[PDB]
Amino acid sequence: LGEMVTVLSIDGGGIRGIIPATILEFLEGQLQEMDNNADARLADYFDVIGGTSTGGLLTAMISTPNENNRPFAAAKEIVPFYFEHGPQIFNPSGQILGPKYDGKYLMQVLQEKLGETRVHQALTEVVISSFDIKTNKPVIFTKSNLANSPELDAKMYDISYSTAAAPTYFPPHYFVTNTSNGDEYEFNLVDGAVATVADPALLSISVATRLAQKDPAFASIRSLNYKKMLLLSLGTGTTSEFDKTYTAKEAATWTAVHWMLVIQKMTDAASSYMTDYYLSTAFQALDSKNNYLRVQENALTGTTTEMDDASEANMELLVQVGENLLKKPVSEDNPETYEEALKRFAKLLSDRKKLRA
């Protein structure tokens, strides 16, 4: 157990980020309870924390240090963050041209809460995704790879805005860092979901796997031994109910405007199904299916399907979705609930930390 590598991964999903935040409030509460430490934080137990879009916002807030070199936010402060700032982040600009939101409020709250902190200060390994529309490549922010590429030591608010800058919802982000020679290095970034990692769990374990080649703390997973890997992957939900989906017949005459409204919800649901399929395949092949815990809601209904609905009523329904998800089974023909599997996961995180002491 002591040699095991621990990875947390949080999906994108706009305001639906309330669902994994509710799950993480439960998990961090279990850790605090079990280790008799009210200051226990997720970053004290996880070697790697990965997130895309609002999952990346969450990652930045629970891994960025405050003045006492402790995580900026407790997991129970995330849902209040969405209730307080969600309505102003998703306040329509009403501008004729451009995205639905001007992103000014989102930039300001991230600047306020993250200050001048840089990714090299992260209290654990972070994996925050984006897509660069200038270089036409994914740009993944981590602490590792800063040795070879120091221009990647961006500010946490630049990284956090960029990972969530969804095309047609927010404007793309432009910012600059400096290279080893002192030359300027520019970023032209959009949401990590465009990099196909709306679910970044496989990217997170790949970053951990590369680190195993150079960091002794990660040596146990060196040659793909995912038996020594604990992975918690959190979804923001999908839907398969006919009332929210489409037929090929109706879609025959859709123009680019209608397709742009649905293409990202489709690619994000696909990223959830495909990433989970790759990971389940890998963990099952090593008879280590229970090392991978995927907490996902598969029947979102009503207003909860919209990632930018920050109305008080919808946010309250998302808390209920997260609280109900805890009581749901981990799979069909397995009555183990998510709450029970998360208590089991907390116990492993706690025992591993005590083992490394």
Swiss-Prot record:
<comment type="similarity">
    <text>Belongs to the patatin family.</text>
</comment>
<keyword id="KW-0325">Glycoprotein</keyword>
<dbReference type="GO" id="GO:0045735">
    <property type="term" value="F:nutrient reservoir activity"/>
</dbReference>
<keyword id="KW-0758">Storage protein</keyword>
<feature type="active site" description="Nucleophile">
    <location>
        <position position="53"/>
    </location>
</feature>
<dbReference type="GO" id="GO:0005773">
    <property type="term" value="C:vacuole"/>
</dbReference>
<dbReference type="InterPro" id="IPR016035">
    <property type="entry name" value="Acyl_Trfase/lysoPLipase"/>
</dbReference>
<feature type="short sequence motif" description="GXGXXG">
    <location>
        <begin position="12"/>
        <end position="17"/>
    </location>
</feature>
<dbReference type="GO" id="GO:0006952">
    <property type="term" value="P:defense response"/>
</dbReference>
<dbReference type="GO" id="GO:0004620">
    <property type="term" value="F:phospholipase activity"/>
</dbReference>
<keyword id="KW-0442">Lipid degradation</keyword>
<dbReference type="GO" id="GO:0016042">
    <property type="term" value="P:lipid catabolic process"/>
</dbReference>
<protein>
    <recommendedName>
        <fullName>Patatin-17</fullName>
        <ecNumber>3.1.1.-</ecNumber>
    </recommendedName>
</protein>
<feature type="coiled-coil region">
    <location>
        <begin position="297"/>
        <end position="357"/>
    </location>
</feature>
<dbReference type="InterPro" id="IPR002641">
    <property type="entry name" value="PNPLA_dom"/>
</dbReference>
<dbReference type="GO" id="GO:0047372">
    <property type="term" value="F:monoacylglycerol lipase activity"/>
</dbReference>
<keyword id="KW-0926">Vacuole</keyword>
<feature type="domain" description="PNPLA">
    <location>
        <begin position="8"/>
        <end position="205"/>
    </location>
</feature>
<keyword id="KW-0611">Plant defense</keyword>
<keyword id="KW-0443">Lipid metabolism</keyword>
<feature type="short sequence motif" description="GXSXG">
    <location>
        <begin position="51"/>
        <end position="55"/>
    </location>
</feature>
<feature type="glycosylation site" description="N-linked (GlcNAc...) asparagine">
    <location>
        <position position="178"/>
    </location>
</feature>
<feature type="short sequence motif" description="DGA/G">
    <location>
        <begin position="191"/>
        <end position="193"/>
    </location>
</feature>
<keyword id="KW-0378">Hydrolase</keyword>
<keyword id="KW-0175">Coiled coil</keyword>
<keyword id="KW-0732">Signal</keyword>
<comment type="function">
    <text>Non-specific lipolytic acyl hydrolase (LAH), an activity which is thought to be involved in the response of tubers to pathogens. Catalyzes the non-specific hydrolysis of phospholipids, glycolipids, sulfolipids, and mono- and diacylglycerols includng p-nitrophenyl caprate. Confers resistance to southern corn rootworm (SCRW).</text>
</comment>
<feature type="active site" description="Proton acceptor">
    <location>
        <position position="191"/>
    </location>
</feature>
<dbReference type="Pfam" id="PF01734">
    <property type="entry name" value="Patatin"/>
</dbReference>
